[PDB]
Amino acid sequence: MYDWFSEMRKKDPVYYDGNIWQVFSYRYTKEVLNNFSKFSSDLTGYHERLEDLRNGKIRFDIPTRYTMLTSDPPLHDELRSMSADIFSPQKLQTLETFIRETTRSLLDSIDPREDDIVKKLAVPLPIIVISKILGLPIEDKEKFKEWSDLVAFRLGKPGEIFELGKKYLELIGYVKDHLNSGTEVVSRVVNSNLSDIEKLGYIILLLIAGNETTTNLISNSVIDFTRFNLWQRIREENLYLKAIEEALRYSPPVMRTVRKTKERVKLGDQTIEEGEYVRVWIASANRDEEVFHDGEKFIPDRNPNPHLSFGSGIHLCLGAPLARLEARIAIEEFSKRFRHIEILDTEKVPNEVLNGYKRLVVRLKSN
């Protein structure tokens, strides 16, 4: 896919295909993400329905349509300010011990003759941590994996990232049943003046939305380090942080995101009408030569590395510090426990926005 990115970057970085607008270069990507007053995140009509949600006129709707992810200021800032302290680096550092012991406990269950590190390490780790942070118990190990998988690009429903159905109704039920069992962040949302619909939305978003993406950051990291044979340079030169930032730049777990225009705007020398959808290719922008020298080479100590894999502007990923911390510990521990890694079989995640592996079968040499 990167092949096409390169050519669109050179010949056509702002491109209308007759359907929607697409952006490929770093400069125009960054400006669409930052300029919240011209490029809206309100894809589900959250602002337009806010009053009727709160006053009860809307009795039923899909809770995950009305979260901070699909809102603009001030509503976005108001929603986000309720949990921003919890996910900041300062507060998360508390958790470094829990993550490190959970990681090790997981590395134990691995069979080095042959195992799937997606199934034994990459999938469980984010689920266990977010559950700790939120105070919600993992009743069924299996249904958390399933619910985590409900996250997906839905065609025709922009800004919707959850697949619906009976699995979804279960998620909602489970959340109602544990409302009053949560930690600090959950209490704040519950006691707030949000509608019940928004509360469910808020919690489900935090519980679920970040699992698969983190799983993918871990897997992509393992893959990239192996294929370019960097495992021992990364370790002897202690490059975990900058290496993982490079995995993020090179193999982003989220490939693209979308905005809608609030008004006629001029992006480069194109004119986008008011009301158009603008698809922003994070993955292409992460390799724009104008910003990254040798953009198609993986460079584990790269610096500076201002990639957009967590986005930019007011929606910059709430979970970015958490994701960096989980990834880094997991790599480190893995890296000290095994020294030779052979990749036997892979299965990519087959869909288009999310970029990772469903299976990653390896054989390992342990120390």
How far is it, in rounded angstroms, from Cα 357 to Cα 360?
7
259 is in an annotated binding site: yes
How far is it, in rounded angstroms, from Cα 275 to Cα 31?
17
Is 356 a residue that touches ligand HEM (CB under 6 A)? no
Is 209 a residue that touches ligand 36Y (CB under 6 A)? yes
CB of 216 to ligand HEM, least distance (A): 7
Q: Which residues contact 76 (CB under 8 A, 6 or more apart)?
A: 41, 68, 314, 315
**What is the pairing mode between strands 257-261 and 21-23?**
unpaired
CB of 342 to ligand HEM, least distance (A): 25
Select from ligand 36Y, ligand HEM, none the partner in contact with residue 253, using the beta carbon and a kind-dependent cut-off of 5 to 8 Å.
Answer: ligand HEM
Dihedral over Cα of 134, 138, 142, 143: its sign: negative
315 is in an annotated binding site: yes
Q: How far is CA 327 from CA 44, 155, 217, 244, 299, in A?
A: 32, 30, 7, 8, 18
- Tell me the site size for ligand 36Y, rule CB under 6 A: 12
How many residues appear in the chain? 367
Q: Return the residue of 254, 272, 283, 364 that touches ligand HEM, per CB under 6 A.
A: 254
Is 68 a residue that touches ligand HEM (CB under 6 A)? yes
Is 319 a residue that touches ligand HEM (CB under 6 A)? yes
Helix (H) or strand (E) holding 138: none
Is 257 a residue that touches ligand HEM (CB under 6 A)? yes
Is 362 a residue that touches ligand HEM (CB under 6 A)? no
Choose one: 54-62, 88-96, 113-121, 205-213; the region binding ligand HEM (CB under 6 A): 205-213
CB of 190 to ligand 36Y, least distance (A): 22
Residue nearer to ligand HEM on the CB measure, 150 or 364: 150
Select from ligand 36Y, ligand HEM, none the partner in contact with residue 68, using the beta carbon and a kind-dependent cut-off of 5 to 8 Å.
Answer: ligand HEM
DSSP track, 210-234: THHHHHHHHHHHHHHHHHTT-TTHH
How far is it, in rounded angstroms, from Cα 242 to Cα 245?
5
Site pattern 43..72 for ligand 36Y (x: CB under 6 A): ------------------------------
How far is it, in rounded angstroms, from Cα 363 to Cα 367?
14
317 is in an annotated binding site: yes
Which tokens in the block code for residue 267?
């992006």
Which tokens in the block code for residue 47?
């602002």
User: Three-class SS of residue 312?
Assistant: coil
Residue nearer to ligand HEM on the CB measure, 257 or 335: 257
Whether residue 255 contacts residue 281, with contact meaning beta carbons closer than 8 Å, is answered with yes
Is 291 a residue that touches ligand 36Y (CB under 6 A)? no
Q: Which residues would be at the binding site for ligand HEM (CB under 6 A)?
A: 68-69, 80, 130, 205-206, 209-210, 213-214, 217, 253-254, 257, 309-311, 315, 317-319, 322-323
Q: Which residues sit in the known binding site for heme?
A: 76, 80, 257, 259, 315, 317
